[PDB]
Amino acid sequence: GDDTALTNLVALASQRLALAEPVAHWKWINRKPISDPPREAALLTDVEKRATANGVDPAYARTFFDDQIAASKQLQNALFATWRATHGPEGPAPDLATSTRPQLDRLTQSLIAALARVAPLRDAPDCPSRLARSIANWKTLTRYDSAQKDALGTALSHVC
Template identity: 35%
Template sequence: MLHSHRFLTGALFSLMASTVLAAPSAVPPQSLKPLLETLNERLNIGDLVALTKWDSGKPIQDSPREAQVIANARTLATQYTLDPEEVAQLIAAQMEANKLVQYGLLAQWQVTGAAPDTPRPDLGQQIRPRLDELQSRLLQQYAAFAAHRRDADCPVWLATARSGLAVDRLHELALVRATGELCVRAAR
């Protein structure tokens, strides 16, 4: 009897401890979900960019375009009362995550010898304007979330909110990269 009581007490304690450790101590801000959805939408556009790169044979790395996007983001940062350097880091993380998707997809297609047979929008006329529109929305949502970046629960909120957003393991990894700049740990 004593043994079963200890077992039940131990099991109950383990269950409570795992629940406490798994759940954030505070409710995530409402601004997190739309921000992550926009980041995920931006990542999914990487699939279309990869298709255009496959067809054209152009390299994924486009340093002049990346510099232009970051410069534009720094300028827009002031409209949202954001630190231009933090915004540059956020946008650079988005581009790195997007390239991760592109490299992953191109590698898959090289193995099979073909890319999916889906419509290819024009990179300059359709995809880039969409990315520019998403950047404005992203900065607005980032501004709404910015006050929560240093919250001790931010990493837990982020991990929980990211769960289930990505379509596959490649996009999940890229989403981790895209959100790597969102939470700021306090210096110890």
């Protein structure tokens, strides 16, 4: 049963990671930096607020979202290197402010709630085994590019 809680956490982490490409696309075109320290710190404060409210350990949640932030930057920088080595993506980027950013904000709430269901299981002996099974079951469905699959590991590296 708790397998589904891990499964949902994996799915929502992948979903948030998929928005890294349109972020990177928008920054690539507009020449804005991948690093945005005041926006990251604002996300981590909001995470601590929502965590405490939903009865989640804030340290657990801050760390998990450290990894969400780190996985996102990892994928964005890999896309920049690919685009430097060849060419940027054809077509305009979705508007960061009105299209992409609202989808990222919705996922903060979703991930907090998903994490609250996983949090009781976090110390269980079979947590890592069941998580790795959920991760492999997801990857064989969606079959994303290797750079995205790579950052998914970072995103989920402190669940257990």
